[PDB]
Design a protein around this ligand. Sequence first.
Ligand SMILES: Nc1ncnc2c1ncn2[C@@H]1O[C@H](COP(=O)(O)O)[C@@H](O)[C@H]1O
Ligand SMILES: [Zn+2]
Length: 418
Amino acid sequence: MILKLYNTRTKDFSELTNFENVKVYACGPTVYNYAHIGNFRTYIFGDLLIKTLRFLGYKVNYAMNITDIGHLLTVYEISEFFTEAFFNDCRKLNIVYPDKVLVASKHIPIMIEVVKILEEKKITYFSNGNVYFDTSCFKSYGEMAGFKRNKTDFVLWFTNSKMKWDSPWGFGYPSWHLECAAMNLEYFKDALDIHLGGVDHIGVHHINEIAIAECFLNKKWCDVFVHGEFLIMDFITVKDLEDQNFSPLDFRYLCLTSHYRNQLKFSLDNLQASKIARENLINKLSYFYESLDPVDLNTLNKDLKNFGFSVEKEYYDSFVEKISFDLNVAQGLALLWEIIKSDNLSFVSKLRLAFIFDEIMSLNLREEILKNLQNHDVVIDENMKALIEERRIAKCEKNFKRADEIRDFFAKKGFVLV
Ligand SMILES: Nc1ncnc2c1ncn2[C@@H]1O[C@H](COP(=O)(O)O)[C@@H](O)[C@H]1O
Ligand SMILES: [Zn+2]
């Protein structure tokens, strides 16, 4: 199945036919303070996307920059501290770690080498202490969106008389536009496939990257640009959300029930609905899982997408169809709830689909079911009294394999045997 996504460059869905090696760049955070949940809506978006490509069978190499420069103790200690915390918040929200993290301060050579090239193509100029890119040397500029020579000219390199680097234009630092563009060009070379960000990058930052890269390359760069819509509040960090007694994954759930091209109206009340819906999901799945016999239970340890019933495959394909049309994970979730409540599926089938959909949803369902069950009370009914005999016998016949298999059945339901 081919992923179809909404491409801002062309205002229609682009088809993604190249399964062998798709390259994805996402603008990363500023690292001068904790990121807020608005930033994480967008990172959950990148996550949903890479996870969907992978789920659909694409091999993805995904890169993210970290801007650790000087917004517009050691500056490095600070940005190092808020770098670890960002990725710590990421782990709390089950956001896949990029395959490559490109740190602006570690890639100044390529940035300088891209300016050198642009200057030799007569595209640049120096004014008021800065090297500017001259956008009129470039008829196409900004078609994706709609002391300077032109309003929309942009800085490439900042200089000053007194974090700083030497250059052919003097000591200075790059603009954020040149960091994103140059780093892509070094890491992915002439060949980005999908470039992500928030909608606010449409009208300045992304078109600026494009200008840099396509003038450098002297050709088409990066066919697909995908943008996520804003999270709107009446800004909040994850700590704030933990401190008000929410769980990170509650915000995750909330991000899941809304397509990436919609604005998300955030509130405590909608976060609360998400917390309850996520809580019921886990409780319902826990009842299903508690109720299993050894043969059904072993089946979920195994190859999940090896379906035992056509009706599972049906729901799997209905799922694929949904996510493959433009990252519609919200309809995926909707589908899981149809599945949970369904009377044409056994308990074991519902869990299989849960565990498969969770490869995208990333709610820790498996491990949330084990935690939920470890908190109910012990009730030894007959079917349990008998596995123990089966076990006490097997441990006497000295068939420790069977004994350990029984043991490992109780453990997966949260029981220990002493
Ligand atoms: N309220 C918001 N909702 C969704 N994404 C946002 C919001 N604010 C910032 N972003 C995105 O978060 C990423 C980094 O944000 P910043 O570090 O503030 O530049 C960018 O991709 C932004 O477009
Ligand atoms: Zn960027």
